[model samples]
Target: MNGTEGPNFYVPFSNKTGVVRSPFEAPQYYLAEPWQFSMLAAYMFLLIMLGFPINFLTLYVTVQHKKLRTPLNYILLNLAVADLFMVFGGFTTTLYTSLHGYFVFGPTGCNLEGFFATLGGEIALWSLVVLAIERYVVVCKPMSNFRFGENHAIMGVAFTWVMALACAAPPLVGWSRYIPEGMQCSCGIDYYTPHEETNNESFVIYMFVVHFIIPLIVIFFCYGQLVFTVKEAAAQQQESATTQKAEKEVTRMVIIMVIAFLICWLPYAGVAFYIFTHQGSDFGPIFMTIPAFFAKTSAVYNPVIYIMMNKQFRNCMVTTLCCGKNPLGDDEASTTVSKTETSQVAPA
Candidate 1:
């Protein structure tokens, strides 16, 4: 011990000195603990069961109904596709990495895998931000009397995705690189640092602000304005009772959307902040994947909110799945129901 021969347990790869190393040169076998693997397995199963069909059927219902084809539905369709990628691409990769006990992907694969997962999730997040703005336009219009154009919505979605690509572009451009972290069961933006470490330190601040903080701020601000305007309209008799009731329903939905997003992501964001600031040695070893998977599972909640909460979507969703007529049936549709129903339950 005094002579520093304490490295006896070490060994080289294939008995070669320098060609390959015993994972010391680089990490290789920081496997998931058994409990971690079991829980992650269950978590992935739950996410797949909840995310897959609901999103598929949600998209199907939207596409099938000619009545459902509005600019807002276009956004919802984009959201559905993004969430599907989030599940199948982002979360499934996490599960795969954990089960394999290492990144099956090589160094290059690590970069692409992390980039793609981040890309899918960024689209999903920005989709909600766009939605909140759309909701604001409809609900707050009595005050501003403004409406968003269809072209604006389409162009805005394209801009969002393009920004996501650029946001993920940093690592490729050498700000920082992806590496297996969080017990070595997954890979993501290597916020810890690069070899020099200082240049990449700023990348974490930039990414967290751009991707996470700004989105949350926009969502809250738009939804906040929406709630204020909707309540003002309702209390001041600025619209009909039918419209007022619809405004309240939209309010409930906005709340659901925000809560679902925050609940899933807040912990993960917090952990990310912690690691960025402290750069601790033991960084979320056991519980890392818990928040990781939880954030990924946000994909499952969107269709639930869309289909179960909105009647038209619910009608189509249930009908198609059950191979029956509309659940509400043709007997009596509400006079309050508008022919042009904007999706995400926003007022037309």
Candidate 2:
């Protein structure tokens, strides 16, 4: 909407803080209202309080527990690392912008924020993708020759970070420029003009498909197969009650992770796509920031999921939190459902 509504008091200039003082607001500049500022601040605080500690505790539990140090779980550890980057790199600036109501960081800050947030998100999505594939192999093809070893899983983790870097690179390199987004206080890829030469249709389309659509499809397809086959395997085998119970619990854990991802990020995906399509509509820019809060909220839930579903991870977490001691020796931890092969469903 061209950042002016009948002679507003504020003027924007692009300086080190990403703004230059002018008597007039710039083309890409946006003005956020008091309500938007308050809401953004609240979400930022929530993301900090819930996101940082939860992800840290996840890492702490994994590091301290010998049982949790398995091949598949390394993927989850990668998850924790990616989330740490997100809360620190992305939401910290989100907090700053909400408080001050303009992009306070210069071009370099814009580039870095865009890079880290995209990297964190891409890493999280690919981590989920690899975790889904691992679950599918173990649960569906239990007797098949195919196996995903530690080396394979490690390669998968490397690929996720690398590919995420690829996606985050285009904006930094110049295909699209980082610019002030909704409310003008914050910045993201300049989705304001989809037809603009720099921020063209190809870039946004690639982002939509590669980042959001394809990742969701791959995840759901793998989990869908895993669900169908695990139930079948459960019916056929005379496995012990413990085996069946562990199987069910692990599946529930992974499903919840997938559900949480869809719930938290879908709004951000939808709003982002909508803005790309309907840029410059009066309310579009004003409303787009709201869904981003939901996307940022994704970092808060998995640590809760980890404890709620899996007894062993929960047990270890409790021990660490309650006292600085391990709950069991290596032998006992190895036999536990969470650490063993039976816990295939715990990660998404």
Q: How far is candidate 2 from the true structure (C-alpha RMSD, Å)?
A: 6.5
lDDT by residue for model 2 over 1-348, one digit each (tens)?
433221112222223355433222323333445565777777687768878888988887787666565444677677788888878877787676666554455455555556777788788778778777777777778558886787877888797898788888877655866655555544566555654556555687778777768878887887777656664333332135345555555666765677887788777677666666765444534566556655666566666677776665765665564553223454222244332223332422
Candidate 2 Cα misplacement greater than 4 A, ranges: 1-36, 231-244, 324-348
Residue 84 lDDT, candidate 1, scale 0-100: 81
Q: What is the lDDT of candidate 2?
A: 0.63
Candidate 1: global Cα-lDDT? 0.59
Q: Scored by CA lDDT, what does every candidate get?
A: 0.59, 0.63
Q: After superposition, how far is residue 63 of candidate 1 from its true place, in Å?
A: 1.0
Q: Encode model 1's per-residue lDDT on 1-348: one tens digit a residue.
A: 110100111111122222322211233333334565656656666767778887787777777665555445676677787778766666666566555554555465455446766786787678777777777777666547676677877876786688688777777765666655455444566554323443556677778887888888888787677554554333332246345553455456655777887887788788666655654334434445455655766676777777565554555554454454223335112221222332223335
Pairs with backbone N, CA or C atoms under 3 Å apart (clashes), candidate 2 = 13-19, 13-20, 14-20, 15-19, 102-185, 250-345
Q: In model 1, where is the ten-residue run with the lowest total lDDT?
A: 1-10
- In model 2, what lDDT does residue 277 have? 75
Model 2 Cα shift for residue 239 (angstroms): 4.8
